[PDB]
UniProtKB/Swiss-Prot annotation:
The keyword Transcription does not apply. It is an enzyme of class 3 (hydrolase). Its EC number is 3.1.27.-. The lineage of its organism: Bacteria, Bacillati, Bacillota, Bacilli, Bacillales. Belongs to the ribonuclease N1/T1 family. The chain holds residues 50 to 157 of 157 of the full protein. Its main location: secreted. This is Ribonuclease. Keywords: Endonuclease, Genetically modified food, Hydrolase, Nuclease, Secreted, Signal. GO terms for cellular component: extracellular region. The keyword Cytoplasm does not apply.
Length: 108
């Protein structure tokens, strides 16, 4: 499993998709993931949440017409999700957050 900021960042720029250990929230939900119980590791062992569209509502990430932002969890192993996320755009800009989307800094 590739779940580090560098690991995932390098993977995305080359293969243009997340590593296989990622599943979207709806996917996770379909497998019986219950957010309030922090049971992801139980229902989807070795998987992390990733690949969902990130709105960029507050315009904190560089916008563009036709640019889509997606996110993925970083450093997750089990229990409740953390506040680590990687943010990647359709034109492969990569940003990070370690505070639940409060602040972003470029990594690629």
């Amino acid at each position: 499993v590739i779940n580090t900021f560098d690991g995932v960042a390098d993977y995305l720029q080359t293969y243009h998709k997340l590593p296989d250990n990622y599943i979207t929230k709806s996917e996770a939900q379909a497998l019986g993931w219950v957010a309030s119980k922090g049971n992801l590791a139980d229902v989807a062992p070795g998987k992390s949440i990733g690949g969902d569209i990130f709105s960029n509502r507050e315009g904190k990430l560089p916008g563009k017409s036709g640019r889509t932002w997606r996110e993925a969890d970083i450093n997750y192993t089990s229990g409740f999700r953390n506040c680590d996320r990687i943010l990647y755009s359709s034109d492969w800009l990569i940003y990070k957050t370690t505070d639940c989307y409060q602040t972003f800094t470029k990594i690629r």
